[model samples]
Target chain A: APLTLNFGSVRLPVSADGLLHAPTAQQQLGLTQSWEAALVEHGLPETYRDFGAGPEAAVSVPDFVALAFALDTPEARRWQKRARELLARAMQGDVRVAAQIAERNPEPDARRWLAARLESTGARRELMATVARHGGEGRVYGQLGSISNRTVLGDGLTSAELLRMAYIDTVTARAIQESEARGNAAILTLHEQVARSERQSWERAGQ
Target chain B: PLTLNFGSVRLPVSADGLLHAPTAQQQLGLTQSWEAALVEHGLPETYRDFGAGPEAAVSVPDFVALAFALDTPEARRWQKRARELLARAMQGDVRVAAQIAERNPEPDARRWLAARLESTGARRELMATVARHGGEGRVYGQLGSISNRTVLGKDSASVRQERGVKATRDGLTSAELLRMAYIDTVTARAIQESEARGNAAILTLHEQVARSERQSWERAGQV
Candidate 1:
């Protein structure tokens, strides 16, 4: 079976060997529907479909730290419902609810949602736990080698307090993927429209 | 037929995903002129690094900022040392403190930068706040409902730029928001220029930059 994302006129198909086959030159510039589908295929909801979309759709390090906790849950469905409930409250004028829910829920998506609303020391701590829980401690610390000691010491924060920072990076990467899919879809759709219009113009000219 | 290396960072052909050939302007030290300008105008040496050390990866915004800095009208003003000082101070440069307190021209800007710098442990607290708050909304919080302590005035330009960069630092918190602002401005122009030139590589490079910054930050935050 071909793994494909249908973006109107553009079809992004993955080779059986797992390589992405992009059509137009600009198609590679944007995120493909295929990757978004893959996220769904991985057990995330269809609501998580456009999760990271648009120019302002940025995911933060804390969001991921929240997700790192939320995504790896055994009770995915229940946790998602709780997350949606919290999200509703936060959206409905009770901004403080975001912090409370973020501290309370360890689900990645839930934490991500609350992290977006507020930045809490508690959320940072939870993010650290998520990293440790996933055995990513070494990889995380090793990555910090490039950051200057000045910023680290000046801020009085060790590697442990880097969850929010980490979350931002993850969010950027995910957004790019999502962006690529979106851009590819738009490009293909536009190209087909142009082609169709051109063909009609030729038909009118009796070609 | 492709690879680009800047400082310790190496970019493979696969990263760009473009059929277009690499240009000389895209080579190492492309930001050399920008770096020279920063020094001539009195800024930090790290400005040359474009916020990507050997360990730190370049981001799309960082690349865009570089292009924008080197190419835009924003880079024209040099004696604007006061603005640079505020930017550096926001990033926690104690070296610029007394200079700002003594000679910076704007009364409100000078007093604000001076108070933050002169106050005991203020720099450290700001840095910590920067890390914890991460995002602007997080740091500033809502009106009358602030969570994290905001040392600088929320509406201050310095505060706005610092919050923007901190929100993006990922795990390390090594780079300053001041540098990020300059780079961001540069990038905005760069994207415009790239589109005009019909160069897809710039666009591709933009996305790669985002991925790289994220990868480096993610790696830094791990155990």
Candidate 2:
């Protein structure tokens, strides 16, 4: 069966920015980049040359690892939880989950990866729908968002439809969204059923 | 610094769990073995067969990566923010972060790297402290409690003197502890300390070999 996708109709970044909304997988990549940058920065002798790389290169903290050195408080705790979820979803290539995280976390590193991860997993539609729904119309996910919008628009689908298909129909997407709400056996089963339907739809659509 | 550190205690684990730690790093001489195992269990894929060989290896998830994947909301968030902060601290070895990440975004992955990152940046004393403190202590800086105790006991003489000095100088221990806490910072700073501290301490410790090299030949031309 051809792989089903909800592309083109999804506008990632939105009209205001035209940037593609960061996808979960893309977020993983960006995070990976950030990690690499951190490793580089943190690896050896520190230098001004290492600062400002964000997700581009590896780097190091001072002497204490940022993880150990910084105190884990309520605020940091929240960020920690969000980051873990986002990172996990991104790694799994769950665009919907990644997008949700992008919405909440608002980290450029995660944002960048979210867009890319969506693209990588071909879940750009799922990602765009998230931004449109949560970001509410004009919000852009990141760069390449215009492309996602163009792709979604070209498909001649509405944001809601695109989101439903990717986030609801897609098994992984549904599980991710549901997982976020709470671990529900019923919703999880529905996710599987929807995923099967989504696959059928893709085959029908000539994917 | 002493070339080798000997601590008094040893927390023995069953042979079954002996390999549970970061042995794959040098033992396998490659990275990806652990990652392959995870992928193997997560689904029905060819990952297991693809790299099932002597040299096959896995990447180690650093602390940030561990927290990112640990499933706990808090750990994940910490992983994200810490990754950002830690990444920004990058000096030159861009590959380290990337290398550590390829392993995963799951909690275990993060824990794996956390262990290594700790192992990588921690001093003999610090690592000893960690070993002594145990796993639960991870909540408290994740220092291995047993190891910490060992280091403390092993270096009782110097530590006692240091403690006495610290007691007399109020806050001196905190300051020294602060310096100890700055391992990553010192590492990053040494990337180019603007001015070198000395041959002994520099920014190049990020690469184990580089640090080894510095230690190996520090007194070659000493006045």
Candidate 3:
């Protein structure tokens, strides 16, 4: 009956209804903060500000994402597709997606609100992760990144964007290592997916 | 030492830096929200200015057309028709807006725009308004080559040329980007608001997830 993510010897605490304990949630802060600082330091100055914040803020990207995918709010439902679409196009280093989304989700306190809620390091991680996991290895989705379509580390990427990707990739690789280590489990060069499924439909440079 | 005259006032027409760079745009008047200069001086309030730079900045043909407007009855008639069309768009007329966006400017609209070009202020506002359209409209002599290699364009040529061209902007090329840029300010605004709302939903879910996660980490009171 306990709702927890079983990591073999190390189990992640959760409630029966599925919630990570606050203090435990706080631990993710260490990893998340490191990411936020690096993101801001690297270039994503907007990643976390003074009073500011990434994991869903309290938890982790993979952790919170697992939950958000489970729980749906009306607003979340309404904007899910929009967010997904934005994430897809965004990975191409398109840039304008931020302002467009900022402009799109026009709640008066929208910027301030997201800024507030984004206080968690996990949330910022997710913000950066969506573009990573959603796209999968090699920029597999949105805008061709076709297969990692790009093989070079320096393509179209800015230091800020690359820093986040580096963080996301490290977390992801480690997540797999951790998962597999437990029992372990699970997965962008930038230009190239072998499937080439039309779904690889993502234009690497999706203009 | 010299000046020129229209139907009413004589004004010094300086070709100094008008429409060329950072200096002379307002020597004549302003555009868009500031077309009042024309209204106050030589043109009518009926004149709706929609031209500016750095798009065809110092158009001599456009310059010639303005002085010509006060000289000929036919030119005046064309200006009348042009004003009507310019009036149609931006005032929430979708068809005409799409029409202007879809193709080149009609001659009347062209003439009307040409007349407004005389206003340095209008040119300044025109460039400012243009700032709203694309994610990164900064290339040499045209919209910049948008970097799409990574979300950060990571110091790519486009970002380098634009001096840290953050991928936080949108490149307006397709119908969707245009829609986001113009027609649906409401939805665009909402997406911004909802990014907060939805992402908050995710965060709230995470709060709950973390609470539950914390529970897993909690040890019983010695029991």
Candidate 4:
């Protein structure tokens, strides 16, 4: 099967038995660098120094995933969301679903990863055509709404594809919530400390 | 002819009216325009006499209080204008130079800031520095001296130890500096995020910090 993403023309191999594989370490680092570069190009300086220095300096994939949530723009948010969906589908051994998800993911890494998976899956043209027609305008099911919410499982998706989408949505939502919580708590603590400093200063002035 | 004692940090007023207070200067981390603003605008003399009649005398804590005071319409004109310039600069606006020239009553202060802003690189560097260090206790005319650089230099072990010693000398603790830095960083991040997203949820978090922080400062005055 051969899967091709429309956004970047990224193609991948799917195994004869219809299995997708994870990306290599180099691939992950490349994704991080591209995203980081995009942010810097947009005029936001690096939050901290030495994030992706060399081959020896690889930041965790989850850390980059966490940063994706911290990004403010709608374009960045949409790209990150679609990339995650493609990666999630690829992880679940469904290259057909992966290609369908990758069709809209703008990041090159996600598209490239799916391209490799499509080739690995024996390049089934019939499966690709069916997934394309049934996938509803290149959207990954359970994204805008969940599998359990509506008939989002769609007609052609299998039980495995439905489960994978549901799991990815739950994990993505949880991580975003956690990041917001952590950021808010840290900032509030800072404010409380400042207030204490102010109170003590006033007392000293009075004396 | 005189030096005002705020614990161990001695703010000396030279024969010709130059003010020298390294500890206060380091804590506030202001630049030369801010220093000139104070000297030319008669703010250092105001600090020397601060709380002298009604209370003990101008101390480091009083310096901190004055830096945060923005409610009064009559607050030292140069200090108010300097703060406005720093605030605008943090928001990526270099046109604050013109605003300083138009609003500041001191001729020297206005002239110095205008010249500094004339250089494009200097203007960008100035904005970046203020964005990193501007907030509550680190504003112009409060703790920072009138100078082009940090009085104690960059972050190092000696600088940290010196700040600790000065804070103790002023009858205060280094905890205050740590707290102020945290506030500065938080405000900086909040401002950066607000520029990207101005929705209710994002702004609500900013408001929470502002309200609580303001309440604390207000309580200090009441006490």
The TM-score measured for candidate 2 stands at 0.20
| Candidate order, lDDT descending | 4, 2, 1, 3
Q: Give the range where candidate 4 chain A is weakest over 10 consecutive residues by summed lDDT.
A: A118-127
DockQ for model 4 equals 0.01
Per residue, candidate 4 scores C-alpha lDDT tens digits across A43-120 of 433332222231222323233333434454564455344444432222222222322233233344433333222211
Give per-residue lDDT, candidate 1, residue A95.
22
RMSD of each: 30.3, 28.3, 26.7, 31.8
* Chain A TM-scores in order: 0.17, 0.20, 0.19, 0.20
lDDT per residue (tens digit) for residues B89-150 in model 1: 22223223232222222233332221111121222233233333332333222311111112
Q: Which of candidates 2 and 4 reaches a greater DockQ? A: 2
Find the 10 residues in a row with the least total lDDT in model 1 chain B: B143-152
Model 1 chain A poorest 10 in a row by lDDT = A48-57
**DockQ (CA atoms), all models:** 0.01, 0.02, 0.02, 0.01
TM-score for each candidate, following the candidate numbering: 0.16, 0.20, 0.20, 0.15
Model 4 vs truth, CA RMSD: 31.8
Which 10 successive residues of model 2 chain A have the least lDDT summed? Answer: A1-10
Candidate 1, what DockQ? 0.01
Count steric clashes of candidate 4. Answer: 29
True lDDT of residue A69, candidate 3: 28
Name the weakest run of 10 consecutive residues (lDDT summed) in model 4 chain B.
Answer: B114-123
Query: What value of lDDT does candidate 3 attain over all alpha carbons?
Result: 0.28
> What is candidate 1's CA lDDT for residue B42?
44
